[model samples]
Target: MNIFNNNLHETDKEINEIIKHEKLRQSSVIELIASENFVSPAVLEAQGALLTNKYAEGYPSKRFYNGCEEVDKAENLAIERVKKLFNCKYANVQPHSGSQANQAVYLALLQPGDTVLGMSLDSGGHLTHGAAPNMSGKWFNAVSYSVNKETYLIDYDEIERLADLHKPKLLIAGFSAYPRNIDFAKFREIVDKVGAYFMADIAHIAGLVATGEHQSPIPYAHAVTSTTHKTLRGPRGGLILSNDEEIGHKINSALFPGLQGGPLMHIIAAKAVAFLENLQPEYKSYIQQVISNAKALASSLQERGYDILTGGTDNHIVLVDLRKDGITGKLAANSLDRAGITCNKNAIPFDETSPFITSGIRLGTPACTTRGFKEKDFVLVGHMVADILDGLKNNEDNSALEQQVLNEVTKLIELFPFYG
Candidate 1:
């Protein structure tokens, strides 16, 4: 009953082989996926602990299962740690991902057919943020808002206008690829006018917000949800932060008896550890460095004659508009990947092409900063991006140059290898 068994089926061997390949993959490339990060070895150790065997189907004291006292302590520790970190009145630690957290919040607050105003997917919002193809779209009426055409930034005035037009019961204030500070107080003002319940999906910038490097939505919104992984650098999980006790109870009920069954106690324990890490002074420094690096990246790219969306980033991400370079976003992303610097194709606001061939690419500094690379490193990354795009745009046949750049990136990667 263990892995690496000599008597295992061939199917089991295939899975182990795949895991080995994945570990090597993580070891090799620079992961620039903004939604991804490498957790500490201690966090991974906690994730693989025996708490995974527990079957706690309900809240701590009110659980339906027996022999849950110790696991109860672990779950409460995670909840309270998150509570203190975000200064929220209550916390729910059972959500498996940010999407599940959003689902629980919706189940707690709204009816099946309530009107919702969410950010549109093509405009840098997540699929769960009311994309017509997702569950949030299927169960409820999903209307969407987008950034302003002139500045490529969130248009609070447009949001106010849309709220007046749609009369939505709920308003979601959040974004996935947006590269600036969100005025949560202003969002609260808009939501108050429409008599709509306000929610903030701080999933992308939770660490910065937690570290006071960005604005906190907790002061303005009734509820907030964020993934624990992205900037939080924890096990893949989600958390709900709210000051209302009734909302807390409703969220608990939705996660347990309503939508999900048993809680994943091992991940909860890892989450507690990550929360404790976030509370450390060093963690705040790391968060600050990430933002600084992002600015450096944006400046370097802009200096090279590239058009960056919204001028520049006030957070840890920057979106590069590729229309000026006469190359597509998909083409730029592929070139970067080939050059061994990973990034994603993203859409610019008011993009003329479809999502598949969007006019922009997004880059972030969290992972690179995690690898201990600073502004100089990001300047090189910016150059690598510009050089690669030049190679692809002019058909420069710069494969040798790309390989040389990859070697330099490899040495940089070795200095601060991931999963250390």
Candidate 2:
């Protein structure tokens, strides 16, 4: 039976068709998209539970509406469990998304005009980290740093120089497309020298951080923001964590009266379930497998003549530069999609092309790993990707090539069927 079936076919045939097709698409495709993940059945159960019918507008034990007695436990469990997961003194299970979590941090810590420094958008940082069109840049005095030209690694010396020049009130340390672990201690030192608040957006590495597969920023960063879905493998939602009591209070106020109200109690309950699962010993093994799969996939692609940025990856993300291969990232991503593989076009460091047609593609191992994929599986996936790109490059009729790929893709899914 397909997942998410609750008499929906009879109650709402139109929307049921949409979900059934999406389920088939997910089951049949090589889902390699960064920032996407498949949650466990336990999480799905909580996310679709009757808690969605409630309206809990305030923190646990403190509500604006009635009938929150049961939801209070769910909210409290989410808050306490996440704090334990991150080893932080405080955590807010609301914020709706990582972006809103970040906005709450900004509102709590800095004025609209206060200078904030972050890695530039093309340098693997997120838009909320001071991209010109984002509110981070529009409302604040935002300064951006970039990676080194030759190494394609974050240039700390340049960041130091910018910190000295800009004297920012906050320094963000994290990325959306970066392929390596960051030195949170090093970033802390820079923040200290500049007398700035430090925030680590570990949205992409939260699971690794929890498993000690990646370094934890909880000790060095005064505040941290993350999405529970990415590597955490939970329902879609956000979390805010901090080591300071006063800042935690400020953040709570920022999230409620300042930013949003009526928290998604259902998702919070799902986040609670995910946090409980992460505390198990097996989660460490899962994180290690994810990293292994990423490295194997990167190495296989390199062997197949693909140019992976920074020689290889230190984490689950692998940025493939396609400029030398005579194809735009857009074309490569489109071709791969047609061939039953999914990924996104991204801008390489110092990319010459516009955002609409980037020079690189960013791939992650989280979702596939959640689907029970391992290193050998990723190696095969790498070859499949190479096959489609080669067919595209050779100007062959891609329809036949896509059909052949889809056949293999469907068979692979049969081998590791989710929720079957």
Candidate 3:
């Protein structure tokens, strides 16, 4: 038998079994990770298609490799669809991931050691926005702003002050865990005052922005970067967009020869499929449901005496502070996981504990909502989560409670079968 003709299950049983295990795990658990979602089967097919064999080294109609005609169409479709989705003039559906997209923007617009002002990581910003350990921070003069102590909202006054103090070349307006809407116009005003470029990293809210559920940064930001996967519900990849023609040109060159080679035609094709889905009316309805479910979940948790950051959420994320219960996010997250709910531990604003044992768990509705969870379902999930936390709060041994919650999770997930 020809080895090339063998299927994955036939060719490699070990890897195949692992993938099956993961699929079973996903189907059984409650996914609350804010940055995760299940892609449509169309997207899955496109991502796993034969386009992966191609090495499309450059943008559409401008390739460094031969036999690029087909892949070029895929890339162009992705670009056009994403542009329509975001109402932007330019889009680069490359960069491999959101962090690389941000890197390309930095490479295109700023020099090494140039000043950049962004929200601090503990204040809910992304690592690409100049966290101390990230490349953006290690290479540049990275200044940071934080949320207001009383409200846990973006401290725009502090941002303005820091922009004035540091004179940053770029001011970023986006976050990894912020649960409120951002005022892009206000950020633009600050950028204008400081004579700096506005760069918005909307990786977490691309779907909301696309559906007009949240404000778009296209009108204000000099450049915007996002992951195609996260809220966009596409394959894992990066995207960059701009209205400024000059900046757009810079971004193209930066993503191509300056940063990467041989773009993933398969993922780009998958992105095109996802973008097409995002343009559909149902996608807007899905986003609306996602927000509603998030609000419901947050409200339920709050009613159970949990501290929800910013009082509540305006978007998909619900940051749960565990300080009052004398529990760490690490413990809560692990307990929840054992109970068949998957989420991540995250630091709350002004958290006293270390990042490894954070004071908060960041929950999101996009994933579970995609799996057919409605407001009521999420409310029940909130109760289950609260029950687990309460158990942890009161008892040193809670395996029985974990098992009970796991059984509840099994029943809930059964009602919303995925990839069946």
Candidate closer to the true structure by lDDT (higher is better), 2 or 3: 3
Candidate rank order under lDDT: 3, 2, 1
**Total colliding residue pairs, candidate 3:** 0
Clashes of each: 0, 0, 0
List the candidates ranked by TM-score, beginning with the highest: 3, 2, 1
Q: Model 2, stretches more than 4 Å misplaced?
A: 1-7
Q: Give residue 389's lDDT in candidate 2 (0 to 100).
A: 75
- Model 1, residue 397: what's the lDDT? 71
lDDT of 3 at 348: 81
Worst 10 residues of 2 by lDDT: 1-10
* Candidate 3 residue lDDT tens string, 1-420: 676798999889999999999999888999999999999999999999999899888788888888999999989999999999999999999889999999999999899999999999989899999988999999999999999988999878888898999999999999999999999999999999989999999999999999999999999999999999988899999999998888999999999898999899999999999999999999999999999999999999999999898888999999998888898999999999999999999898887789989988999999999988999999999999999999998988879999999999999889985896
> What lDDT would each prediction earn against the true structure?
0.86, 0.89, 0.93
Off by over 4 Å in 1: 1-13, 396-398
Can you write out model 1's per-residue Cα lDDT over 238-329, one digit (the tens) per residue?
88888777777888888878877888999999999899999899999999999888899999888888888988998888899888778888
**lDDT per residue, candidate 2, 1-420, as tens digits?**
665575887878999999888888788788889898888889989999989889988888788998899999998999888888888899999989999999999988999989999989989899999988999999999999899999899878889999999999999999999998788988999999989999999999999998888889988887899989899998898899988888889999999988998899989999999999999888888889888999999999999999999988888898998888877889889888888889999898887789789988888898888888988999999988888877878875777888888788777867885765
Model 2 — TM-score against the truth?
A: 0.96
